[PDB]
Amino acid sequence: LAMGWTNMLYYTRGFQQMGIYAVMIEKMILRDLCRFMFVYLVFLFGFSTAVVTLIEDGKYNSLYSTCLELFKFTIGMGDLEFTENYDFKAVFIILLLAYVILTYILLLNMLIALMGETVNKIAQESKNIWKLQRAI
Amino acid sequence: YKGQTALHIAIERRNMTLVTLLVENGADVQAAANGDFFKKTKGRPGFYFGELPLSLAACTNQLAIVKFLLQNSWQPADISARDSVGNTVLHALVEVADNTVDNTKFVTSMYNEILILGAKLHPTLKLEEITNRKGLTPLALAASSGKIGVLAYILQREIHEPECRHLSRKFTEWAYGPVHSSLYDLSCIDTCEKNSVLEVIAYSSSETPNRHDMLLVEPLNRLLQDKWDRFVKRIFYFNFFVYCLYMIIFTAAAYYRPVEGLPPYKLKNTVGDYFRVTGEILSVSGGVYFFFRGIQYFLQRRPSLKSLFVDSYSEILFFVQSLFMLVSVVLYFSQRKEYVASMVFSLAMGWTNMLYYTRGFQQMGIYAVMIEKMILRDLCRFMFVYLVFLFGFSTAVVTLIEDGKYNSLYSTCLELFKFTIGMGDLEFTENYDFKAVFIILLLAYVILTYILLLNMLIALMGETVNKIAQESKNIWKLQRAITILDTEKSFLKCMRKAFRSGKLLQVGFTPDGKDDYRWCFRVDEVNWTTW
Amino acid sequence: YKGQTALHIAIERRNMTLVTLLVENGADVQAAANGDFFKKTKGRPGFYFGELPLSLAACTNQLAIVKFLLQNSW
């Protein structure tokens, strides 16, 4: 059901503006989202493993839970205090702050800038791709 | 000034009559002006030219005067002369160039003319292997000094001159119509065992004006790509896989660390415990390996203690990971719990060091270079300003708060920081008086940091992206070149195998009856225009 | 290479005299150079032109030579 609903974009061809917009979306998902996802996933897995290792025992003593909790930061929902079951609170807070600075502050903003450049660069190519799609 | 002799002044004055009038009656022509005004240094800015009358005439672009050499009523003007630093005329020419347009143009033209005349007068002499006190050939000096224009000139030299064309460096083999194949000499570029253009450029200090743009010259780029595709691609992929496997084992070992207290911990006779301990051993061994590798790099390269913390971030990061691992082991055997903290620090650093291998894939390598530049410039500036703002307003707020949980600098600073990540509260406490002041302070802080500075950070990064495309690509190319050079010097699987290029007899005959082989390198080219 | 005939070389050399000297006395003009150097593929980069003397002259942009077609002693 979800795949079918999201496949409604296919028909956006046949309307020049929305067709070009859909082509923009393709190109973005192909290049920028891919690169950012690779780097960000490496970062997230690394820091998540470190954090779970630090945690002594409790609800968040599993890789899945800690990974989800670290990911919650990316969507503006981080906690910075989601657990206390550990020692050496300084290390925990240092790790969380480093992860925040590296991913949220830097990489997301970089994603916005790279997309902006991409938009600035692929106007004519997007229009031509839309024309080819309509021809097909 | 110490050698402003009559002929010196005449040449500096650029007159064709006084020079000749001195030439007659045998004016001395081997005087060296070692005056402090004639040396190289910023103090009392003078004009270094080579210290010899021939060199001076050359630096002044006096071709007309030149060709006075090897005449009568005259004294020797050996092209193989040497000053107090051993520089020849060619060395002076490379020194004077400043990578401008006209300067390049003239300097290359002269350099040529002197080459041809020297070949004519003494065909049995070999200029370009002459070396100075530093032992650097003029090509080597240019490579190590930042003069891109001359590098491009020499490396693409052509002299279609019937009797002494052998000095040329670029050759054309066959033209079966519109497509023809050319040869580029490799001698003293990839393998010299004393000084090679590639090794010099790669390991050149950070102060070189054009270290990045040097590799864009034709021959160098083709050679690096060729070596890559030949063997470095596979060697690098193998190294990447090994590092990934080591990281996986380290993570697995750390994850299952026992929780009993006061290490070291007794080894129960079990399969799982056995796997944990062997994984530990593997991880510690990898840490030792990286530590020794970093030590070897530090001793072999011998950084000048300034570029040490300014270049080679990757070496520093790997060495720091090794240090954390080793300290973790030391504590683990010292009966302390902090080995866990050291272990997690090392684990996170190692995982985030996986970006290093993103070189070897053009797109991701350029992306990593973008990330570097951003962290270096934009993140730094924003962090400084934002930290000043945050500390100021945090101190003000904590002062305002009367007493309670948030009556400490750390807690209030954390609470104010929570705003930056879209988690602010605006009501996290009420223990105070004068709520208007509190809300005013919080609103001012929000407006100044969240609304303004973050958005400004996005805009500045956008500008940076728009500005550093080509530089990022060039930096990635340099990184890959350094990787190729290390790998080749590593003897990991080479052992002088994995050869470099093909050999040919290109001249047919040198000026002497003997022939020669010049270790050439082929690159086919096709052109329609210019039949 | 398999068909580097005299006229082939002359055309590749782009001279108006050798071509005519071969044209007289009826030089053959339907030779196909199926040499591996004259085929299409990356290995041993050569120059594919069509494999025929007319095609070769065309790929070389020799209009002057062209229009030699449909003449005598030919």
- Shortest alpha-carbon distance between residue B529 and chain C (Å): 10
Cα distance from N-terminal residue to C-terminal residue, chain C: 26
Contact with chain B for residue C12, Cβ under 8 A? yes
Nearest partner of B492 among B227, B199, B232, judged by Cα: B232
B362-400 and B409-420 are packed helices; what angle lies between their axes, rounded to 10 degrees? 130
The count of C-alpha atoms lying within 13 angstroms of the C-alpha of A89, restricted to the half-sphere facing its C-beta, is 7
Q: Binding site annotation covers B356? A: no
Question: How far, in Å, CA of C69 to CA of C30, rounded?
Answer: 13
Closest of B366, B332, B68 to residue A114, by C-alpha: B366
Distance, CA of A117 to CA of A52 (rounded, Å): 37
**Does the CB of B177 have a partner CB in chain C at under 8 Å?**
yes
Alpha-carbon gap, residue B138 to B127, rounded angstroms: 9
**Structural contact between residues B352 and A43, judged by C-beta atoms closer than 8 angstroms:** yes
Whether B179 and chain C come into contact, CB under 8 Å, resolves to yes
Count the neighbouring beta carbons within 10 Å of the beta carbon of residue B40.
Answer: 10
3-state SS of B168-189 is CCEEEEEECCCEEEEEEECCCC
Transcribe B186-244 into DSSP letters: -TTTS--SS--HHHHHHT--TT-TTHHHHTTSHHHHHHHHHHIIIIIHHHHHHHHHHHH
**First vs last Cα of chain B: how many Å apart?**
54
The most distant pair of C-alpha atoms in chain A lies apart, rounded to whole Å, by 64
Please report which helix (H) or strand (E) contains residue B521, including its range: strand B520-526
CB of A113 within 8 Å of any CB in chain B?
yes
Q: What is the dihedral of CA A29, A33, A38, A42, to 10 degrees?
A: -140
DSSP secondary structure code for residue B518 in this structure = -
What is the residue-wise DSSP string for chain A? Answer: -HHHHHGGGGGGTTSHHHHHHHHHHHHHHHHHHHHHHHHHHHHHHHHHHHHHHH--SSTT-SHHHHHHHHHHHHTT---S-S---SS-HHHHHHHHHHHHIIIIIIIHHHHHHHHHHHHHH-HHHHHHHHHHHHH-
Q: Compute the distance between CA of residue B157 and CA of residue B217 in angstroms, rounded to an integer.
A: 13
CB B370 within 8 A of CB A110: yes
A91–B364 CB contact, under 8 Å: no
Taking the C-alpha atoms of residue B183 and residue B522, their distance in angstroms, rounded to an integer, is 5
Q: For C14, which of B181, B526, B531 is closest by C-beta distance?
A: B531
Number of CB atoms found within 10 A of residue B428's CB? 16
**Which of C44, C47, C59 to mutate to test binding with chain B, by most B CBs within 10 Å of its CB?**
C47
Helix (H, G, I), strand (E, B) or coil at B418: helix
Degrees to nearest 5, angle at CA B54 with B51 and B57? 95
Nearest Cα neighbor of A126 from A16, A8, A2, A40 is: A16
- The residue among B449, B446, B447 whose CA lies nearest residue B425 is B446
**C12 vs B176, B181, B528: nearest CB:** B176
C35 CB within 8 Å of a chain B CB: no
Q: In what order do the strands lie in the sheet with B520-526?
A: B170-175, B179-185, B520-526
Resolution (A): 3.3
The answer for B271, left when phi > 0, alpha when psi is -120 to 50, beta otherwise, is alpha
Instruction: Give the 3-state secondary structure of residue B370.
Output: helix
DSSP label at residue B269: S
Q: Strand, coil or helix: what is B108?
A: helix
Answer yes or no: are the C-beta atoms of B412 and B397 closer than 8 Å.
Answer: yes
**B30-37, long-range: CB within 8 Å, 24+ apart, which pairs?**
B30/B75, B30/B76, B30/B81, B31/B3, B31/B5, B32/B3, B32/B83, B32/B84, B33/B1, B33/B2, B33/B3, B33/B4, B33/B5, B33/B8, B34/B2, B34/B3, B34/B84, B35/B1, B35/B2, B35/B3, B35/B4, B36/B1, B36/B2, B37/B1
Interface check for B530 against chain C (CB to CB < 8 A): the answer is: no
DSSP state, residue B64: T
d(CA B117, CA C17): 39
Question: What is the rounded (10 degree) CA torsion for B208, B213, B217, B218?
Answer: 140
Query: For residue B177, what is the nearest residue in chain C, using CA coordinates?
Result: C12
Distance (Å, rounded) from C-alpha B7 to C-alpha B22?
6
- Sign for the pseudo-dihedral over CA of B494, B495, B496, B497: negative
Cβ B429 vs Cβ A112: under 8 Å:
no
Is B288:B329 a contact under the CB 8 Å cutoff?
no
CB crowding B18-33: b at 16 or more within 10 Å, else e: ebeebbeeebebebbb
Q: CB contact, 8 Å: B404 with chain C? A: no
Q: Which among B347, B363, B457 has CB closest to A53?
A: B347
Shortest Cα distance, chain C CAs vs residue B518, angstroms: 22
Alpha carbons within 13 angstroms on the beta-carbon side of residue A91 total: 24
Tell me how far apart the alpha carbons of residues B268 and C50 are, in angstroms, rounded to a whole number: 79
- From which experimental method does this structure derive? cryo-EM
For B132, the enclosing helix (H) or strand (E) is none
* SS3 per residue for B378-416: HHHHHHHHHHHHHHHHHHHHHHHCCCCCCCCHHHHHHHH
Dig out the tokens for B40 from the structure. 């190289």
Residue A47 is nearest to which of B348, B374, B420, comparing CB atoms?
B348
